[PDB]
Design an enzyme around this catalytic site. Structure first.
Site, PDB file in Angstrom:
ATOM      1  N   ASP A  54       0.736  -1.056   0.452  1.00 26.69           N
ATOM      2  CA  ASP A  54       0.069  -0.033  -0.174  1.00 26.69           C
ATOM      3  C   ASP A  54       0.925   1.751  -0.018  1.00 26.69           C
ATOM      4  OD1 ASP A  54      -2.389  -1.851   0.207  1.00 26.69           O
ATOM      5  OD2 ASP A  54      -2.717  -1.391   2.320  1.00 26.69           O
ATOM      6  N   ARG A  58       2.550   1.429  -3.899  1.00 31.75           N
ATOM      7  CA  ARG A  58       1.132   1.978  -4.160  1.00 31.75           C
ATOM      8  C   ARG A  58       0.616   3.493  -3.989  1.00 31.75           C
ATOM      9  NH1 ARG A  58      -2.695  -3.044  -3.802  1.00 31.75           N
ATOM     10  NH2 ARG A  58      -2.556  -4.145  -5.547  1.00 31.75           N
ATOM     11  N   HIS A  91      -5.257  -3.749   6.095  1.00 35.54           N
ATOM     12  CA  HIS A  91      -4.826  -3.375   3.934  1.00 35.54           C
ATOM     13  C   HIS A  91      -5.756  -3.570   3.503  1.00 35.54           C
ATOM     14  CE1 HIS A  91      -1.027  -4.774   1.852  1.00 35.54           C
ATOM     15  NE2 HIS A  91      -1.621  -5.964   1.658  1.00 35.54           N
TER      16      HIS A  91
END
EC number: 1.1.1.37
Lengths: 312, 304
Positions: free
Chosen positions: A150, A153, A177
């Site tokens: 995460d 990204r 998550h």
């Protein structure tokens, strides 16, 4: 230091093992384990690369030979998409795999740091903790849910929006998550601000980024290479801390003080025994405070599901 | 610099694309192509990694959009007699697309059997009128990195510091590691015969250990990334970049032959001498010639 990858024959596990064989410190050991019979051959393939990282692979039901002496275990086993299997089916398969492999960990290398990659991390880390507690070996400083995908990204999408070098952006991402539990703290990125629309749009993008890959793959697979890279960042960070490097900080999902939920992802200083310090999440914007409060019901239910899986 | 990977959806191609996304110089572009419908999403997966390499993926039958403006094309596309014919036709097709869209690119052929598939590529490029012998390479780097590993292990050396020249071709007895030229190390006759056999059969070693699950993919991705990064460094003007690769040279031994190459702005800058060979190496070189020449002829006949 010795690292075990459990689930090494899958797409994530092969990408992670290739990155670890090439980037682990010289004199490290790497073991690969997966039920797939190809796994010793994955290790022989990698053993031909001339780095000072000894690598061996193992198959069958017993992960013991891979786990013996392991300092870090990265568990990427499981399935993202399988013909005929819906979300609940995949959850039961992955939950079962995590429960089995963490029981092997508790038996063979209970003092190792454990990074759970297998999804859904919000629940599978709670399964891992319940297995470890049952074995009487749980150390809350040594169990991590790997949420680094995460973060990378977020770094990529913010650097694109804001016209920055992608390797120079670091976004803190807290909470869980999956879906609405993923909370990128865009308000803490230095040097820039975001409009409310950009925050809503980027947060949604970050929370749904896995679909973006499934869709471009015409439903034919899911994120594996970026997950491998994310897992390698987290594994190499933990290795450096375990060897004594100071100031190593990563966000990961860990059992903490329960201010928000029993398990929660927040920035962590890592050290020679796993988590060295759970760092404050810092100041939140109104959108971030509301998104945090808004998802806590969901996150606490995810956690409870892992507890109930292990007993029932 | 733009690098195109053709066959990107395969095991080798995905490993190679992961390494290039993370190790190409900032500001580079990487394009992935494969008929597999997954390909555009293999690039999207990789595009989530925050490095300054722009990546895009393409599927369908037309590699043009991947090949436009490409400076280096690495071809790992493929998949016993029917197997060869399929792979040969895949290389012949992809090299024809290269000849149409980016004929000035450096072309690394990874698809096996390299000894033959490079000959197919050369004849395709010659038929298109754009063949430049300084720009077509058979990627034999997996043999070099294996030899480095095995010598380092045997002799207790830092594996990153050992560099074994490997000459000849890329299969079985045509693979010739010049163990006599490794500085600071000496080998018994037994060790030379054993290391040479292990290097020559390493591909089979992996197939066997994989028990049905295929051949070397991850180390072949690393090998191809080393070779492609060396080509990019040289194309950008770095000096002293040397790699062994299978190329059309002086023909002293065979039309195509792998030897040390100084790389530069236009592909091969200089074909370097193989140097002094031990008696064992001389007898291995002589012994492989007929096999290598037959491999080359098979590729020429396939096109012609």
């Amino acid at each position: 230091m010795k690292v075990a990858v459990l689930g090494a024959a899958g797409g994530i596990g092969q990408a992670l093992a290739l990155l670890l064989k090439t980037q682990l410190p010289s004199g490290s050991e790497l073991s690969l384990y997966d039920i797939a019979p190809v796994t010793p051959g994955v290790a022989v393939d990698l053993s031909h690369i001339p780095t000072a990282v000894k690598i061996k692979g193992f198959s069958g039901e017993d992960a013991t030979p891979a786990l013996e002496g392991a300092d870090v275990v990265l568990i990427s086993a499981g399935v993202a998409r399988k013909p005929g299997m819906d979300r609940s089916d995949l959850f039961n398969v992955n939950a079962g795999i995590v429960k089995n492999l963490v029981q092997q960990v508790a038996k063979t290398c209970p003092k190792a740091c454990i990074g759970i990659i297998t999804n859904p991390v919000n629940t599978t880390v709670a399964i891992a903790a319940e297995v470890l507690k049952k074995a009487g070996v749980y150390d809350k400083n040594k169990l991590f849910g790997v949420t680094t995908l995460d973060i990378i990204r977020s770094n990529t999408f913010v650097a694109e929006l804001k016209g920055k070098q992608p390797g120079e952006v670091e976004v803190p991402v807290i909470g869980g998550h999956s879906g609405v539990t993923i909370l990128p703290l865009l308000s803490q990125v230095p040097g820039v601000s975001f409009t409310e629309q950009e925050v809503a749009d980027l947060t949604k993008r970050i929370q749904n980024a896995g679909t973006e890959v499934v869709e471009a793959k015409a439903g034919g697979g899911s994120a594996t290479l970026s997950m491998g890279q994310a897992a390698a960042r987290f594994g190499l960070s933990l290795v450096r801390a375990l060897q004594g490097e100071q100031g190593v900080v990563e966000c990961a999902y860990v059992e903490g003080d329960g201010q928000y939920a029993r398990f929660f992802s927040q920035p962590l200083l890592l050290g020679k025994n796993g988590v060295e310090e759970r760092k404050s999440i810092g100041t939140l914007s109104a959108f971030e405070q509301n998104a945090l409060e808004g998802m806590l019901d969901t996150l606490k239910k995810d956690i409870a599901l892992g507890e109930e899986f292990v007993n029932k």
